[PDB]
């Protein structure tokens, strides 16, 4: 039997050209009125998955 | 390019064959040859061994007695592994042992084996094993005795030559094979590799074309 990739992990995480695993930041979907624009601007884009989650994220992505 | 002289059953020398360097002068590779021969034996082995686990042992579908009160150990089936007559926990099951070694590895191992044979001067070319149309183990034995005095000899004979196959078939240490089916295990098993001339040219043409 082949190994199945985790669907949520696949939809949440991507990889870069060298192998960095990349995620998105939270607290941005709604309730945006009282959030200042400075805090809103640090919450978008992508960030590298922290070294603690690297192993589990790789496991979920590969199999 | 080492030479090999052709002999005849009559005892005379017919001609010479030129063994290509790319086939008979490669450097032996012990680890590669060991891997290939081990893979060959693994493919040879048949794994028709089996045991019945706790599931396929007959009976034993009922709890033998109550969980509590009897003063004995808890048992859930009379066929549990710890029972006499119970199933086997991690026992043999039929399995396929053959592995997928690359063709380049296989061919290089065969080249190394035949190259070692050539280097130690153990390759013989023969126009024909016995005089045609009737098998004769006596004639074949005499000719092979004049050829090599070693115990185990491989004979590489074409598919259509029945007289030589039937003639050397019964000799104890002799193994008869086709030029198409040359393999590292057989080559290393033999002390001497006795080629028929047509088998030699067929092998050389097939591998160099």
């Amino acid at each position: 039997p082949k190994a199945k990739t985790h669907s949520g992990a696949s939809k949440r995480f991507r990889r870069t050209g060298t192998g960095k695993i990349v995620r998105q930041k939270a607290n941005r979907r709604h309730l945006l009125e009282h959030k200042p624009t400075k805090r809103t601007r640090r919450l978008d884009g992508r960030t590298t998955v922290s070294a603690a989650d690297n192993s589990r994220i790789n496991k979920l992505l590969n199999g | 390019t080492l030479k090999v002289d052709v002999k005849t059953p009559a005892g005379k020398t017919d001609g010479s064959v030129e063994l290509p360097a790319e086939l008979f002068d490669v450097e032996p590779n012990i680890a590669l040859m060991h891997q290939v021969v081990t893979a060959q034996l693994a493919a040879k082995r048949q794994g028709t061994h089996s045991t019945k686990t706790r599931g396929e042992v007959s009976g034993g579908g009922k709890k033998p007695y109550r969980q509590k009160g009897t003063g004995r150990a808890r048992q859930g089936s009379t066929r549990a592994p710890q029972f006499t007559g119970g199933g086997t926990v991690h026992g043999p099951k039929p399995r396929d042992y053959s592995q997928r070694t690359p063709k380049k590895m296989i061919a290089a191992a065969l080249r190394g084996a035949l190259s070692d044979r050539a280097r130690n001067d153990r390759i013989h070319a023969v126009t024909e094993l016995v005089e045609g149309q009737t098998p004769s183990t006596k004639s074949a034995k005499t000719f092979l005795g004049t050829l090599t005095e070693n115990k185990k000899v491989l004979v590489v004979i074409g598919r259509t030559d029945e007289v030589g196959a039937k003639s050397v078939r019964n000799l104890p240490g002799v193994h008869v094979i086709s030029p198409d089916q040359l393999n590292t295990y057989d080559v290393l098993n033999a002390d001497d590799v006795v080629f028929s001339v047509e088998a030699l040219n067929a092998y050389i043409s097939a591998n160099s074309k």
Binding site: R12, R23, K25, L60 | A31, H34, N120
Partner: protein
Amino acid sequence: VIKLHDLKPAPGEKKAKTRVGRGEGSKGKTAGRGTKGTKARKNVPVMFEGGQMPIHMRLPKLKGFKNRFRTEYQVVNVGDINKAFPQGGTVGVDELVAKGLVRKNSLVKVLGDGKLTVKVDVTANKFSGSAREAITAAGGSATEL
């Protein structure tokens, strides 16, 4: 002469299997599991973090869609063409796959990375601006399929 009993594995090839739970000398009575618990008996799923919202559920899904009508190209740079064709000449997809530069039956786009110093007649599905200029400057034609 090499016989069948002279065949040995390469040094460091084979490593002795770890047989576990075979006495207190090596790995006894627990087999490297420690005392009781969950891991003492079965396993723990990877996507499980003890009860709190797992890492794959508390982050937003990556934005966007996939666009299954995407036209994907296999790319080759002018530097590789320069290295592989010292004598110049016509360069099409057939010889680009012959010299092992792109896949066999794909779409080829040519990119201008290296330096081109030979006369070459390139034919491809698509060309980049830099690649086309670099090919033209060396007196070659960038014929587009």
